[PDB]
Symmetry: C2
């Protein structure tokens, strides 16, 4: 069990967590301004994204705040407390994502025009706001700018394969 004290400690860490609502998420601190993520459960399970532009700060020793906005218009504020194996995340979903989540279940990078046309056309308000604590079930050192971490759609057994060490090689690349 490693102690996180600095931003450098945090960057390059790969996480799997589960919100109190039972929603399982995956997330990767690729470099100081970039994140990859993959959704395994809940309303938007199936969604995954690479090269997401984000603000990443250390609030105070070992506590990290990540802020971004998505192609669908979803806003995300995550607070990592890895020394306590926990997170707090607030997700602000546009109305249309709650109504039609199926649209957004894709590799969003390959469907940006669809997301943006959908977010303009459909309802934004009222937002669905999900502020929840989470338990971290996996933490691995991927190194930074590792393009293999999140590079395929989720499948049901994936998080288990990751946690059992059946997914990545000695280079932290896909088996």
């Amino acid at each position: 069990t490693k102690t996180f004290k600095t931003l450098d400690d945090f960057l390059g860490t790969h996480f799997i967590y589960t919100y109190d609502n039972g929603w399982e998420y995956e997330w990767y601190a690729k470099n100081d301004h970039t994140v990859d993520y993959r959704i395994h459960g809940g309303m938007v399970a199936g969604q995954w994204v690479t090269d997401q532009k984000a603000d990443i700060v250390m609030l105070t020793e070992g506590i990290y705040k990540i802020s971004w906005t998505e192609p669908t218009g979803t806003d995300v504020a995550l607070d990592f407390m890895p020394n306590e194996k926990k997170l707090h995340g607030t997700i602000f979903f546009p109305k249309w994502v709650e109504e039609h989540p199926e649209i957004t279940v894709t590799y969003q990078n390959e469907h940006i025009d669809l997301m943006e046309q959908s977010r303009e056309k459909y309802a934004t308000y009222p937002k669905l706001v999900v502020p929840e604590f989470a338990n971290i079930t996996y933490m691995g050192d991927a190194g930074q700018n590792n393009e293999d971490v999140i590079s395929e759609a989720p499948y049901k057994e994936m998080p288990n394969d990751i946690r059992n060490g059946k997914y990545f090689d000695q280079n932290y690349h896909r088996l």
Copy 2:
């Protein structure tokens, strides 16, 4: 100054702070699910709000996270480190607010319906995302559910008057 350790230490605290971008803001933890705010600087300078429903948690000892969504559509995620006199805020502004913050420059409570029509009528995207650290320049024990704290429109010398003890009497009521 005082150590903040629990949610009760935090609730009822009245704050003034200045973000790294120079925007001065005022904020009040009215109760465990409600905030009051008043804006002194930057984009929406002059806006003030009472009775904004918010999610308030303590992340870990003395660190507090406040999440809410506004009548204009703005999404907010605030992090308080009152023991270090530091804040980090991320404000996700709808595009039309950055376009015409003046509509929004008002006592929002008397203008909910205007804000709702405005947010549907005008452009949401792209969002202006403002993630910034802030120095806390004032903290006062207001007590919970004190409606005097934020009960008038900002004026130029107000944060100075508050800091220099010329705004409240000993009961934390307006002078």
